[PDB]
Amino acid sequence: IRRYTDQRSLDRSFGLVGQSFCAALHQELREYYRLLSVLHSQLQSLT
Amino acid sequence: RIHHDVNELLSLLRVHAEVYIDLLQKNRTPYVTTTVSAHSAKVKIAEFSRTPEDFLKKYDELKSKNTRNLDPLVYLLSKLTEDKETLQYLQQNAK
Amino acid sequence: LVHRILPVAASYSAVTRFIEEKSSFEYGQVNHALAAAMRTLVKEHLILVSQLEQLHRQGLLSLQKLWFYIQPAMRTMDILASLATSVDKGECLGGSTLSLLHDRSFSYTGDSQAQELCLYLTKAASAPY
Amino acid sequence: KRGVHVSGASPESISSLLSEVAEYGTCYTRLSHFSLQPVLDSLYSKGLVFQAFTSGLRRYLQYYRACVLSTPPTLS
Amino acid sequence: TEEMELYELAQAAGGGIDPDVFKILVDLLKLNVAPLAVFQMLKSMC
């Protein structure tokens, strides 16, 4: 999703419909980054 | 509506007044689905035990087929109680 | 006594497959909504197993009485192996599978634990239809 | 475990005690063997009453195990 | 006949009908007919 997202958002011919779309993909990736430190800190029922 | 092919022709196709009244007796309603079958009618194939494994195995495969027409065959599994009153005409017809 | 526990564990692999086929989007509106709750059923069964899978480091488990632990616990899992057949009859969809799920929502009445899963799946599955 | 004759010196008398719990035992193995297999509304010969009957019969056999296994082996 | 549910089911246990009449009776299940009425109308003339 990251590789598709930056490789489509870098394309200036891809337009606003596509740039805002991949910006939404970026923000959903930023929201996705939350739980990866939780999975850390619960080791610092799960099983 | 379309009683020409499956009621008039089916009434005319019999080898034997109720010539036109048989379609009114078998006047089907196309808006229904009311089968009179039950799970007790599954033992109708047990009387024909010529090869009962390949007489009992067919019903699960016919149910596993994606057609919903296997339900009204409860009376048709028993069929006619007269001795070969439908089955024996094919041997005369093949000649 | 291992083979007493084998079929529930076997049943789980049919139901996580019912996720990863019936939640690919080609099957139909009613069908994806069933797998949307079968998502919940696999984590429910694995959360159940997470109440036991810790225990080997302290020895509470035993081979005879794991049957006693699993006998009320299959009802979260071992209903759904049949719900697979209920969609896999002809790749059924739409109202023509909701009729079968409708009559399956009243199906088992003597034990009466297989009714609720079909009922609760019909609630999720019929809503978008 | 019928050591007929010799067998490390225990007489006919103990065989007549052991072959009593053969009667209780084979009736538990066979009645539990009879009650063990479910019907699932699927055996074709067994209307649903028989399912509830066999369930209560397994409740009884579970109580029987719960009694046997509570028993200290430190008894004659 | 010429169908998987019209032809295979017509010769399972003991079998035997007229083939065209058997195909018409197999097609009558899709015509939403009451199972007893068509058989009674056939048996009242045959």
SS3 of chain E:
CCCCCCCCHHHCCCCCCCHHHHHHHHHCCCCCCCHHHHHHHHHCCC
Between CA E12 and CA B56 the distance in angstroms is 9
Q: Which residues have a Cβ under 8 Å from the Cβ of D76 and sit 6 or more positions away?
A: none
CB of C42 closer than 8 Å to CB of C12: yes
Structure tokens at B35: 């089968």
Tokens representing B5 are 């092919």
Three-state SS at C1: coil
Whether the CB-CB separation of E26 and E38 falls below 8 Å is answered with no
Cα angle E36-E39-E41, degrees, rounded to a multiple of 5: 105
Rg (CA), chain E: 11
CA D9 distance to own-chain centroid: 28
Coil/strand/helix, residue D58: helix
B65 contacts in C (CB within 8 Å)?
Answer: 90
E-chain residues near B9 (CB < 8 A): 24
Q: Phi and psi at residue D4, in whole multiples of 5°?
A: -65, 125
**Residue C106 contacts residue C114 (beta carbons within 8 Å):** no
- For chain E, the residue count is 46
Q: What is the DSSP letter of D5?
A: S
Q: Which helix (H) or strand (E) holds C85?
A: helix C80-87
Task: Find residues 54-93 of chain B whose CB sits inside 8 Å of chain C.
Answer: 64-66
**Distance (Å, rounded) from C-alpha D22 to C-alpha D20?**
5
Burial class from Cβ neighbours inside 10 Å (0-12, 13-18, 19+) for residue C104 reads buried
Helix axes C29-49, C115-126, angle to 10 degrees: 140
Provide the sign of the torsion angle of the four alpha carbons D54, D59, D63, D68, taken in this order. positive
CA-CA distances (angstroms) from residue B64 to B37, C85, E5? 18, 9, 11
Nearest neighbour of E30 by CB, restricted to B69, B84, B88: B69
Rounded-to-5 percentages of helix, strand, coil across chain A: 80, 0, 20
Method by which the coordinates were obtained: cryo-EM
Given the structure tokens 């996705």, which residue do they identify?
Answer: A32
DSSP B73: G
Q: For residue B42, give every residue at least 6 positions away whose Cβ sits within 8 Å of its Cβ, in sequence order, or none.
A: B59
* Farthest-apart Cα atoms in chain E, separation: 30
The alpha carbon of residue B41 is apart from the nearest alpha carbon of chain E, in Å, by 13
Chains that touch E (3 or more CB pairs under 8 A): B
Resolution in A: 3.6
Residues 6+ apart with CB under 8 A from B33: E32
Cβ contact C124:C36 at 8 Å: yes
Per the CB < 8 A criterion, the answer to whether E16 and E38 are in contact is no
Answer yes or no: do B64 and C92 touch at CB < 8 A: no
Distance CA C70, CA C52 (A): 10
Taking residue C73's Cβ as centre, other Cβ atoms within 10 Å add up to 17
Give the whole-angstrom CA distance, residue D26 versus residue D36: 14
φ, ψ at D48 (rounded to 5°)? -60, -25
CA C33: distance to chain centroid? 14
